[PDB]
Design a protein around this nucleic acid. Structure first.
Ligand SMILES: [Mg+2]
Lengths: 269, 1091
DNA sequence: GAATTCGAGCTCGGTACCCGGGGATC
DNA sequence: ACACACAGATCCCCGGGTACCGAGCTCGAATTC
């Protein structure tokens, strides 16, 4: 086949069908930048950016020998190399496999499926294998490294954070940390707080890293409530990047794999 | 003392003066507008250079040529001038009813009068004499007549042996709703009894019939629809001409003639010049048997031709536009009129009618003297009526036997006739070739717009070129550039106002333009020579030339079939009614498999299939039976054929009991065509062309006959025979298919039948297998043979089949051997014939609704698929999978240089040069703007953008060159500025702005406008590409477009207006900014930040 | 002795069928 | 005094339209803490 092979056997394909399961048709109109150290599936929802890195360890067998190839997810803009990955699209999936043959400017992907039917025999549908060429020139942009502040959150907490602040445009949505280990996210009307603690090496204690740093940051467009509630995010962790001249804050889905949205803020007043 | 009043303007003293006040140059600007619409009592004046005289003036001298010896009744030709012409030509037959009291004073002797005393039909033979002189000959002795069964009227009408029936019929005319039929004596209805068998239903035994003679046509259409519907009253529609033609054996409606003295020495009778009924120089009137044909005199004795073409200014009161004839403010400004000769193709006079002082450019006068063409005569005029009358008095004075032009029946004659009939109130019933009350009308329906002028065969050229040549631009200038390639200066009618008000030099610039246009048309006419082909058909069928031009295709076959039935003592019904006429299965294994075929596809088209079937199988109306009682006394398998067409179980006997009228008809004609094509090398080249016209007429009229029968509810339809003809067509196509599969599905049996196949073997496996079939064509796909010697073997295959299965008049013919082919649809395919030629059968590869770029790249695409081998073989391999399997399997590599065209036709629209102006997407701006029900059209978007931004709009009949821009960033606001200025006193990503709201104008788009819109252009490009190349993928438009769109490298950059925000947020890059190494490490850095 | 979901029902962007006027040159 | 006549116009691709289907995703009375 290709030199560069991806395969998901049922164990790892259940572990990924669940990653796509917490629920979406978001990341179907996507972009996959595949290379060594895995597939990065990037999309923009409500303007803001969302990433879902799919590590090479997270597949059953992965090997990328060659430079990165970038595939638009929607093959002829209708199907999707991940439209198989939904919860209950074809509920007989046993294996899926990707081989991207050819050379560095013209690597072309083929995706193959395998269902099981009774007596456990495994049938490849020849009508639900997709094939997508690479992109000649993509330019994708990415976040960086160990964050400037970091804290853990849970589905009730995160619900509280989104509902608190996220009030629609004409409402400046302000995140803030206080001394004595305090977090607050407040807006023109609502103000919810949480104490963050150590041991991260009743609904308002989190256990984080970078637990010392304050900030009074503000987001300008109001998407956190709606990006995060579109991915049906069951909580997660928040990670603040403040070094760059505009901070960006990266909310992840702690539950096992991630669809992480990164958010660009109003210049701190 | 003309006998029949002449209904042309011999003289007019008053008219309705319409003329632009641009004409005056002392008329300061307020009085320098509109048309001076009015009235004047002065005889209309034409100014020619320095000279002036009445338009309507014969005089000693003229400004145009004249060929009529009367004009207004005073003789003009000189004192003597009695051109005795035994051998006259006849180019056109008129039939009209000349009520013998209405030709009392024509000063005949008493023969022609006696014949037609209350009323009769007179067939006048307009022609021309080798001496030169135009002439007309009146054949008086014709009657229409018709048959009704003997008992079916004796008993039904309850009136005995035919004279009693005769009176009954005249009673039905006179005891009737209205004065249309006047003073009918029975003796106007002389009848007889006859025995003619019924053309239909041969077990209809030869019947006793009544054949009642009916003098006039009008009395016949009343006795054909206002007499008892419950007898089919045989043969009442028949013209007077075809009775004249048939009844006299050998005659023709075009070709030389002779006046024969016989039968008590009744020579044709010379006409007194005060009794002429036409524009002819000598006339005679002569019974049918004072007349005679000759052959071997093929030459047209100096007939003339007027190639006129008009130009009009459309100013109204504002909104310069298309003119419209009903608007007295909209008016013709100049008329070019190029009086050629027809025998010697010698342009003889160049007239030019002009509204106002007009100075032809000194370049133009030199140019016309340099190409040896006569000196154009520019006539100045003062009013539109003066011009239109002057032109029309030329058409009567010159009397061009043939009239040509571009669109003259569609626009020019409709305009001039419409101006002349309601605005100026001119009777056009005399301006043809009969002085009084001929036909000069124009049936509107649309572009099959029929013009009938009597004795002026209006061979338009738009209607002729539309048939002859198969471009699809069909504007004169493009047509001349395509057939003639002459390097014309083209004008627009946005300089008609500019050039018509500038002055006499510029009005002459318009005059120069109209002369150039008519010279182009003249050159077209005398290259195609339409008169020769129509004249061939007109003397082959039996109909006059005018009729072959305008009316139907079934009257040809009908009149000849009528000659046959007249010899064979047959009758022919009048279908149970044309209740009024208005003017103004066996095939599924034999259809496209929709694939590509490099293997040589012999094409075995049957040779005039349906006539060969009609003449092989003895199909007719008179061979049919419907009960096997009618074939009780005729054996099966020798003496007949039981065919069941829909279940009807019809029985066409074979030849030796009853000959088929249609077989004998087609047989005789196919023999004449064979003889003439066996006469070509032993003629002089102009006469090889003349015989080519003759054989072309035979071919056309012989392929018509299947349409003649089959077409429902017309003249002698017999759907049973057409049903059999099509049925046998399918069953011989299937018999050929089965036989081909049967004998020659093993090569060695082929080689045992045709030894020459030894060398014609190809490497692979072998098969003859039909792959397409339709009407007269099966495309055998001789897999495993070579193309080279093939058609030599195809012709022997065709022979072997045609004699081994089919009956003798049938012949298969290996016309072609497509070395490559692409069966698109049931009537669509793109082959490449052996000698090398791109045959394209009806997938219209150039789309004028697509721009020039799209048509040029799509046709480059096709000729890549074909002409490039190592591509074409890959488009072949494309049809050895199911179309859908090509979504997951990469295409075969040979198609690479295919995608390398599309990736160009994409790149070409997004490259820096930002145009090559013609991306036109012309609008075809359906007729009347501001009444486009759907609105929101692209071309309307530019229409109102011009109505805001520097308009120049000849609005109504004109298309807009319109480009689509790539959602330039301000244009949303500008469409909302439309959405208030459309209404003319009556952030949120604003929905992907509708394409027609991005239709920015080309000129403005070029001047500054950049970065043109891919999605609409490339998408229409792929729409044409998929429309053609879906046949590779089983007509799966989805799959075709999915594969074709997979050729384009697509780029993905974020918008820089949020790349800027991210770059302010310091995102790392992973990509094709041409940091290659980086992409890997930064992607590791995505995963380190995110997981 | 204290609050929550997924259920109908709305919009929501489609979205893709599926449904409404074309050509014909001067 | 002619009666005057007049004795076939369709049907295909591109572009709007949301009848409704259906597919997603936010959603308001039965659930589980
Ligand atoms: Mg014209």
């Amino acid at each position: 086949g290709a030199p560069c092979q991806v395969v998901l056997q049922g164990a790892e394909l259940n572990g990924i069908l669940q990653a796509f399961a917490p629920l979406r048709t978001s990341l179907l109109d996507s972009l996959l930048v595949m290379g060594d150290r895995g597939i990065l599936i990037h999309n923009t929802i409500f303007g803001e950016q969302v990433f879902l890195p799919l590590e090479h360890s997270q597949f059953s067998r992965y090997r990328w020998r060659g430079p990165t190839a970038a595939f638009l997810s929607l093959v002829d803009q209708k199907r999707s190399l991940l439209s198989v990955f939904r919860a209950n699209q074809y509920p007989d999936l046993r294996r899926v496999e990707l081989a991207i043959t050819g050379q560095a400017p013209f690597r072309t992907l083929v995706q193959r499926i395998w269902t099981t039917t009774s007596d456990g025999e495994a049938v490849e549908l020849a009508s639900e294998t997709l094939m997508k060429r690479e992109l000649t020139s993509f330019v994708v942009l990415v976040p960086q490294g160990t964050p400037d502040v970091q804290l853990r959150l849970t589905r009730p907490q995160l619900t509280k954070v989104l509902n608190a602040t996220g009030a629609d445009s004409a409402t400046p949505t302000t995140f803030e940390l206080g001394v004595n280990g305090k977090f607050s996210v407040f807006t023109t009307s609502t103000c919810v707080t949480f104490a963050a603690r150590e041991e991260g090496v009743n609904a308002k204690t989190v256990y984080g890293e970078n637990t010392h740093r304050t900030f009074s940051v503000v987001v300008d467009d109001c998407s956190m409530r709606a990006v995060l509630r579109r991915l049906q995010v069951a909580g997660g962790t928040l990670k603040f990047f403040l070094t760059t001249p505009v901070p960006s804050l990266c909310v992840t889905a702690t539950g096992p794999n991630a669809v992480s949205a990164v958010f660009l803020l109003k210049p701190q007043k | 003392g003309p006998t029949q009043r002449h209904t042309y303007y011999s003289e007019c003293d008053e008219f309705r003066f319409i003329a632009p006040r641009v004409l005056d140059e002392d008329a300061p600007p307020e009085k320098r507008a509109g048309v001076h619409d009015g009235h004047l009592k002065r005889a209309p004046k034409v100014y020619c250079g320095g000279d002036e005289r009445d338009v309507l003036r014969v005089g000693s001298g003229g400004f145009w040529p004249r060929r009529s010896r009367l004009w207004g009744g005073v003789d003009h030709a000189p004192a003597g001038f009695n051109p005795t012409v035994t051998v006259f030509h006849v180019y056109d037959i008129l039939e009209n009813v000349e009520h013998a009291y209405g030709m009392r004073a024509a000063q005949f002797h008493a023969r022609f009068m006696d014949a037609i005393t209350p009323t009769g039909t007179v067939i006048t033979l307009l022609g021309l004499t080798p001496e030169g002189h135009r002439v007309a000959v009146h054949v008086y002795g014709t009657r229409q007549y018709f048959y009704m069964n003997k008992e079916e009227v004796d008993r039904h009408l309850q009136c005995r042996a035919p004279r009693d029936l005769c009176e009954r019929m005249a009673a039905a005319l006179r005891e009737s709703p209205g004065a249309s039929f006047r003073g009918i004596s029975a003796d106007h209805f002389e009848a007889e009894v006859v025995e003619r068998t019924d053309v239909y239903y041969y077990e209809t035994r030869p019947a006793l019939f009544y054949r009642v003679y009916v003098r006039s046509g009008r009395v016949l259409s009343y006795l054909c629809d206002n007499f008892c519907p419950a007898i089919k009253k045989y043969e009442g529609g028949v013209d007077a001409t075809t009775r004249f033609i048939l009844d006299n054996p050998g005659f023709v409606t075009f070709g030389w003639y002779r006046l024969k003295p016989g039968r008590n020495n009744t020579l044709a009778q010379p006409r007194a010049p005060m009794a002429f009924g036409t524009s002819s120089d000598v006339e005679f009137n002569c019974t049918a048997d004072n007349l005679a044909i000759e052959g071997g005199m093929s030459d047209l004795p100096a007939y003339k031709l007027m190639c006129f073409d008009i130009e009009c200014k459309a100013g109204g009161e504002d909104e310069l536009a298309f003119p419209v004839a009903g608007h007295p403010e909209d008016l013709v400004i100049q008329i070019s009129c190029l009086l050629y000769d027809l025998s010697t193709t010698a342009l003889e006079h160049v007239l030019l009618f002009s509204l106002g002082s007009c100075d032809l450019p000194e370049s133009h006068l030199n140019e016309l003297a340099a190409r040896g063409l006569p000196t154009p005569v520019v006539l100045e005029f003062d009013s539109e009526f003066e011009m239109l009358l002057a032109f029309m008095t030329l058409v009567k004075q010159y009397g061009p036997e043939f009239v040509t032009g571009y669109n003259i029946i569609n626009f020019d004659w409709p305009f001039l006739l419409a101006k002349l009939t309601d605005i100026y109130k001119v009777p056009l019933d005399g301006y043809g070739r009969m002085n009084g009350r001929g036909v000069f009308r124009v049936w509107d329906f649309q572009k099959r717009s029929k013009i009938k002028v009597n004795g002026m065969v209006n061979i338009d050229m738009y209607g002729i070129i539309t048939d002859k040549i198969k471009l699809s631009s069909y504007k004169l200038n493009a047509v001349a550039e395509a057939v003639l390639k002459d390097k014309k200066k083209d004008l627009s009618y946005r300089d008609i106002p500019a050039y018509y008000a500038t002055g006499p030099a510029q009005r002459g610039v318009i005059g120069e333009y109209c002369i150039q246009d008519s010279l182009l048309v003249g050159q077209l006419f005398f290259k195609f020579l339409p008169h020769l082909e129509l004249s061939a058909v007109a003397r082959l069928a039996g109909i006059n030339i005018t009729r072959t031009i305008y009316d139907g295709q079934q009257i040809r076959v009908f009149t000849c079939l009528l000659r046959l039935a007249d010899q064979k003592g047959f009758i022919l019904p009048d279908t149970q009614g044309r209740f009024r006429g208005a003017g103004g299965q066996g095939a599924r294994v034999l259809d496209p498999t929709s694939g590509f075929h490099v293997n040589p596809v012999v094409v075995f088209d049957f040779a005039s299939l349906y006539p060969s079937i009609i003449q092989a199988h003895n199909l007719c109306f008179s061979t049919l039976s419907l009960r096997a009682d009618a074939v009780a006394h005729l054996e099966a398998g020798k003496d007949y054929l039981e065919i069941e067409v829909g279940g009807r179980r019809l029985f066409f006997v074979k030849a030796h009991v009853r000959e088929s009228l249609l077989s004998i008809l087609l047989r005789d004609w196919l023999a004449m065509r064979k003889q003439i094509r066996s006469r070509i090398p032993q003629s002089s080249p102009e006469e090889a062309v003349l015989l080519d016209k003759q054989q072309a007429a035979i071919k056309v009229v012989c392929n018509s006959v299947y349409g003649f029968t089959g077409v429902q509810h017309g003249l002698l339809p017999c759907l049973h025979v057409a049903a059999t003809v099509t049925t046998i067509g399918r069953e011989m196509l299937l018999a050929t298919r089965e036989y081909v599969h049967a004998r020659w599905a093993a090569f060695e049996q082929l080689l045992a039948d045709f030894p020459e196949a030894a060398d014609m073997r190809a490497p692979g496996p072998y098969s003859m297998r039909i792959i397409y079939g339709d009407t007269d064509s099966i495309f055998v796909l001789c897999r495993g043979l070579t193309a080279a010697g093939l058609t030599a073997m195809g012709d022997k295959m065709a022979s072997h089949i045609s004699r081994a299965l089919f009956l003798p008049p049938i012949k298969l013919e290996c016309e072609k051997t497509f070395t490559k082919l692409l069966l698109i649809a049931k009537k669509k395919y793109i082959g490449v014939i052996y000698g090398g030629k791109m045959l394209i059968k009806g997938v219209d590869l150039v789309r004028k609704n697509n721009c020039a770029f799209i048509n040029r790249t799509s046709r480059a695409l096709v000729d890549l698929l074909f002409y490039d081998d190592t591509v074409s073989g890959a488009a072949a391999a494309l049809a050895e999978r199911p179309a859908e399997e090509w979504l997951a399997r990469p295409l075969p590599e040979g198609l690479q240089a295919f995608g390398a065209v599309l990736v160009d036709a994409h790149r070409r629209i997004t490259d820096p040069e930002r145009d090559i102006q013609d991306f036109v997407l012309t609008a075809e701006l359906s007729r009347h703007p501001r009444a486009y029900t759907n609105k929101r059209l692209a071309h309307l978007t530019v229409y109102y953008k011009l109505m805001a931004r520097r308009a120049q709009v000849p609005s109504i009949k004109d298309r807009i060159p319109y480009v689509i821009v790539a959602q330039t960033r301000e244009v949303e606001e500008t469409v909302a500025r439309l959405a208030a200025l459309r209404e003319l006193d009556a952030a949120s990503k604003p929905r992907k702005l509708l394409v027609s709201e991005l239709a920015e104008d080309p000129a403005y788009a070029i001047a500054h406008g950049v970065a043109l819109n891919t999605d609409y252009y490339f998408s229409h490009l792929l729409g044409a590409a998929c429309v053609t190349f879906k046949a590779l993928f089983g007509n799966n438009a989805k799959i075709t477009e999915s594969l074709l769109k997979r050729f384009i490298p697509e780029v993905w950059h974020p918008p820089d207006d949020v790349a800027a925000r991210l770059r302010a947020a310091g995102f790392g890059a992973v990509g094709a900014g041409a940091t290659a190494e980086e992409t890997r490490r930064m992607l590791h850095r995505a995963f380190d930040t995110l997981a």
